[PDB]
Amino acid sequence: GYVLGS
Amino acid sequence: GYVLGS
Amino acid sequence: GYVLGS
Amino acid sequence: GYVLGS
Amino acid sequence: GYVLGS
Amino acid sequence: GYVLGS
Amino acid sequence: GYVLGS
Amino acid sequence: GYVLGS
């Protein structure tokens, strides 16, 4: 899975 | 599944 | 397929 | 395939 | 299948 | 055949 | 054959 | 398969 934060 | 927050 | 947007 | 963006 | 978004 | 556009 | 463009 | 993004 993936986690992206900006 | 997915979680998106903005 | 699928598309999610927020 | 897949695309995730934030 | 296909997914297109613009 | 097929054509998809967006 | 096939063509994809974006 | 293919993924294109622009």
CB contact at 8 A, D1 and H3: yes
CB contact at 8 A, D6 and A4: yes
Contacts with E2 (C-beta within 8 Å, 6 or more apart), sequence order: C1, F4
What distance in Å separates the CA atoms of residue F1 and residue H6, rounded to the nearest whole number?
Answer: 25
How far apart are the CA of G2 and the nearest CA of chain H, in angstroms?
A: 11
Question: Which residues does chain E have within 8 Å of residue C3's beta carbon, measured at their own beta carbons?
Answer: 3, 5
User: What would the DSSP string read from start to end of C1-6?
Assistant: ------
